[PDB]
Amino acid sequence: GSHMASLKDLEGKWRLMESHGFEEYMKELGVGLALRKMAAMAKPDCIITCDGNNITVKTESTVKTTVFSCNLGEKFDETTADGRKTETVCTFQDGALVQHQQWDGKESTITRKLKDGKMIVECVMNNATCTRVYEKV
Ligand SMILES: [K+]
């Protein structure tokens, strides 16, 4: 039952092909209605790059840019696209980029995994999971 994954196959630019439950996970995060339904109308490209241990995930909408960098495993502060201020940590575990965010008791996860050349992106907050499929541009 052999598998292997490596951080660098997630490198490249990723077009959103698909989405299930996004608007709800965002409601769970406390995303205001305007940014919630507007965010869903945006078809953003996820752009991932890495320099060894150091990773950068960029999110581009036509009208915004949010971006973070980090050495994997080290806690770092994050300005999420919706204004949340989290203490984030990124690891590569079980063949996936894992982004754990913590903010005021509450917390969330975003896992990014290469699967058949597609990047599968599942977000989880307090039992509200979303999945979004990006294709390689
Ligand atoms: K690992």
Residue numbers in the entry: -3 to 133
Manuscript excerpt for this entry:
The aim of this study was to develop a dual FABP4/5 inhibitor and, to this end, high-throughput and fragment screens were conducted with X-ray crystallography as a follow-up method on those ligands that showed appreciable affinity and favorable physicochemical properties.
During this exercise, 229 FABP crystal structures from various human and mouse isoforms were determined, many at better than 1.2 Å resolution.
